[PDB]
Assembly symmetry: T
Homo-oligomer: 146 residues x 12
């Protein structure tokens, strides 16, 4: 792995978390049903984390002398996360998030491989920190769906 | 003015502030020069306000039974703000923001006209609150450029 | 509009919010069902706002040299809000509140007309502030009922 | 004493404290004279305590499987406290409160007898807690009147 | 009653609250269903109180020159609370807790009898404080189950 | 109305609040009598608000590209508020403030007319915010004088 | 028991806690040895509690229309606690406090008897609250002495 | 001046502030009249300062290897402040305090002379700090008496 | 290593920390000697950490779709930590803890091996975090024993 | 030196700090250039200190039975500080402040001479406290100008 | 790698961070130029981190039974960082820090190799934590220099 | 005395406190024995004060246009404090500190003479502030050694 490989892995997540920031706002606004208050709030906490993550990842890429993706056009052309359709039920939103977080978990695992093979412990650790939280999110969200 | 006219004005700003949220991150990350610390921090405060604004505007549209724009594809197709090119100097970034805020100020003025003619005092007031802050931003930023 | 017209509009709301303070306590205490914790807490926040509102409205009437209604007998003879029957389901309570808030929203709209035609910007603004929050409440509560 | 006897004693206080909540607002708003600032603030603290008390007493009645009174019509038909006439001087207001608190103190004493004879230590203790504070209030208020 | 009788009553609760601390963790971890977030959090607050209670009860026994039970083997041989089976539904967990709290309420009542007949007002009061909270818990939890 | 008309109205208040800042210090220092503690503190809170107001008004004038008055010589030549004579009784000080606030209230009303006719909602709102507080002050202060 | 009997019991403690406030300062200042930091701090916390107690007890006597002892000459003529000799070792100070607290515990027990037989639940409870803490202090302090 | 001279001056104040701590409690408890709330609170703040002062002065004497007076018997035999008679009006209490503080101010002045002539800048400064506050107290209290 | 191997390692620690939570309470309650205050407090901080650890470890096992041990019977049958005998001196307690922490350190080292060989970076990191603190504890505790 | 000499020295500073309060607002509002944010904020902190100083100095003059200057007309006729011309560059503003602070430092030195020769340690110390801060300001501001 | 190898790597950093603590104070004190406020503050934050680091590294060496370097003579004989010459411009200071941090980054990388090859995950992680921050510092500081 | 004499006295303390900062870390790390927790913490508080002192003294020298010593080589060549030998017992460490603080107290006394004879009240006061605390430290530390 090279520093450039790590910059690329970091940028994919910058893109993903920007798309997720918007998608979480989508679900935060469009949730309905007796579990409105729970999800509305939950999704807000999630988007808050998404925002901290975008700045963290981007600033680590600057730390390694890289260029963080910084346009919506680029996030859309780079992210692997589908945007909200704003039509799904509360159930669909939670299942979609389990799916999205799950996919991101898989991306983080590979991303940590790349950073490790490039001898980049800090970037690996940053990615790990998100991985740890997303895995917590998936359990709780899957539990919710019973 | 109709409630739908107001929903439209509100959505243009939802789109604008999402694009600005990203653009402010762009400038926050790419700023260089002896005024790095000042701008880096300043732009961060600005993006923080942008984020609060997106949720406020969108939730007011829900309050009026409207659909807030909730996809990046839609923000790009709707916003009137150009995305960061990530190549400008510290000077260019500040001047661009004065220009962006200035244009948004003009949009808010019209937007407040529409809400007023629709008998919508709350939406008018929300828009005013941003207008008041942006005008403060423009003075300080223009002062900076001497 | 005259100052007296505004004092009257303000007093109707003083009466309404006193009746609502009690009604919200009613629902806060009598809620049952798997959404007990959500509503119990929610209604408590609502009654907290009701209490702040009674003092605000009454103190604005003092500010304009008026007499704020200050007896339960007068609130009952003046308010347009029906008291809780303490027998409704969680669903009924939320629907009733949407209805109550909705009616109050309509009263506020007229009340703001009166204050405006009397050249009373402060009272108009106070009434607006509640209007803005109630509209937020109605969206969330209606969302809850799916 | 039976649990029902205790529920009744608790409800009389729920009614009394609701009537007092309004009466304290009355005095808070109508106080005049060089001791305006003192009393205005003092009465506000008093109404704040009244509000906490209504919820506490009512929730203890729920705890014992009872129905807390939850309508203004019922508070008026049950409370032993006369509503404010909003015409009294600062002196009259304080003396009236000494009288009201004093009467409530006597009600609490009997109420604690009933709870004790029903083997209800928690309700007795709750009532005691108010008794302790009201006795403090009476001393200070009587001291004020010299 | 003797001081030793009171030490015994206190130790049964030390044992009970240790077993409950674990059982509450069980339910906190194994809860599933759309009410996951509510119960997960609720049970956490409950275990937090259980922990404060174990230290309080044990330190009162030290205060009376007694030996607080301090081994898991002893808690299991002394507590009257059945451990979680980790297989029950969200409904079962809440009903079980209502049952457990209810039984503990009955134990506290007797325990307060013993302390009173031993002339031990402080221990009686400590036990009362828990009794008061558990009764609040039972109402809310029973309300939840509709 | 023109932007210049609004800048002028804003500057008159900048001048007034500077003169009031000093006058409030005068009364804060020279108050005597059994109501020393009340007024001394009250006047301090008032001067604190006066200081926030000077900066707010001046910064809004900068926001509109105007020059805020910034010399004592200019405040004295522009303000309509008479300076403290430092010889009045506690009664005179409070009555004087009711008079001063009352006059400022009348100035704000006209000032809001001007901003409105210039299409300047933000400046109108800023002025309103003070108007709302001064009216509260006048009621309390007039109440004090019985 | 009569209210006067309770006033007397309360005053003995007002006297005792004033003498203890000074004695605790004595030990706080004169402690030496490797356990200086522990005791110095500990005694400070103890004197802090002593001060809160003096005001609480005295204000309860005012609540019952009594005269709280308020002179050093009277505290010395009434307290049953011997003043510090300022010559004892760290060991002696702790043992003395165990003895002093122990004696006060015995006084509180009787004092609670008197309040109970006078039908004074609040004063009994106040005294209990100190009793509960002193018993905690005695255990810890006796533990310290091994 | 010698270190012993300074220790003596410090001890007179330790004695004075202990006597004042009690006297301030006296006035705090026995104040009556429409200025009850003001004085009651004021005297409490004063006694709070008295308590901090006793520990500060005593710890400075320890710092200079001296023995701080630590018995009530010694404070009474050393202080120059007369104890409260608990019979004076609110007016008398305030005038007495002006007199007491005034006398202490005169003692501090001499005490600072002694510390200065002993080359003890720290003790001089400690004494000064109280002197500065007492002079503030005297102005406010004298102002109160008109 | 497999995910199941990691779940097993995590559960052994869930069991160990539950047993330690109780044992730390044992030492917290039974400590005596001039170092009572130090150890009593220290052990409390230790048990506080033990409690956070149980929830963290268990929630990570849920994250990996495993079943966390949740009964006292299972903790006793699984933990490798001996329960307190409540008879040891302060010295014995500290030495025992050094021994217990030391053994746990060795378990964590192996546990981190297993997580690493299973490609489980998050669980490895969680275990590391405890390892880091326990090693700090052992140094301080060994230092204490000189 | 006499008390009157000290009152005069104190009043000159009351006047100076009032003029400086306005001048600092002048520079706070009129600063421009890339160091806008730095100075704008810096000057605000400076004016905040100026405000605390005016009240402190004036209250010390009351403490010594003097009349603090309390009119703008008197500050202008007494202060030795020239008002802002609102036309200077950022550089000029900072240099002017170094000059103003420097002159005030020289005034404080003389002022402390006067207080010392009048045997007024408290006023001398108050003046010293400002002197200490202004000297810090001058270093930083001179450093800024390179 | 052996534990001793890790102790050595840790001690080199203890020495480096002590030398940096002083050097950062040097730059904090000697900075001049229009970027005085920025750097002065920035360097202070940096020295604050340096201080936390010295204690962390040293306490980890104690944790591994090692001797942390604890004399200035040893830091100077061991550190690889050159001390400040106190003569450099603001530019030189920042460039020097980029160079110093950069060198330390390279030392940390090797140091983490050693800890890893010794099977010391905790020490490796501690070193990583600094590495992560220093890399952030270098980007910002290099950005500043344009 | 001249300003240069004062700069020299200030620099000796800058050197001393830097050497003490390291020495306190030495004792903080190397303390052992049953009083580990006490001293470990105590020494940490002491080093914290040492750090604040270095910056204060150095910034006062900048205030007087002097050059603060800013290299370890210079501190070692200037300080009069011997560095820790890291071999002493807990007893030796405390005695050494009493000796070190005592010597510094003597240096401060002379240093205050110099500042006074140079007409430098601020520097004299700064030095006094440390003197006052060190004398407190010596009493407590000497008390500890019995
Ligand atoms: Fe950032
Ligand atoms: Fe939202
Ligand atoms: Fe109010
Ligand atoms: Fe409630
Ligand atoms: Fe405990
Ligand atoms: Fe400002
Ligand atoms: Fe009190
Ligand atoms: Fe002390
Ligand atoms: Fe949890
Ligand atoms: Fe003041
Ligand atoms: Fe440390
Ligand atoms: Fe500094």
């Amino acid at each position: 792995s090279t520093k450039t490989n790590v910059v690329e892995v970091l940028n994919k997540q910058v893109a993903n978390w920007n798309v997720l920031y918007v998608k979480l706002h989508n679900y935060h606004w469009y949730v309905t049903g007796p579990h409105f208050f729970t999800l509305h709030e939950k999704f807000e906490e999630f988007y808050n984390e998404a925002g901290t993550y975008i700045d963290e990842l981007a600033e680590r890429i600057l730390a390694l002398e890289g260029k963080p993706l910084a346009t919506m056009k680029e996030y859309l052309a780079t992210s692997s996360v589908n945007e909200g359709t704003s039509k799904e039920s509360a159930e669909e939103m939670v299942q979609t998030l389990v799916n999205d977080y799950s996919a991101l978990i898989q991306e983080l695992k590979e991303g940590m491989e790349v950073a490790g093979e490039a001898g980049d412990a800090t970037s690996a650790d940053m990615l790990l920190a998100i991985h740890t939280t997303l895995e917590q999110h998936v359990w709780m969200l899957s539990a919710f769906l019973k």
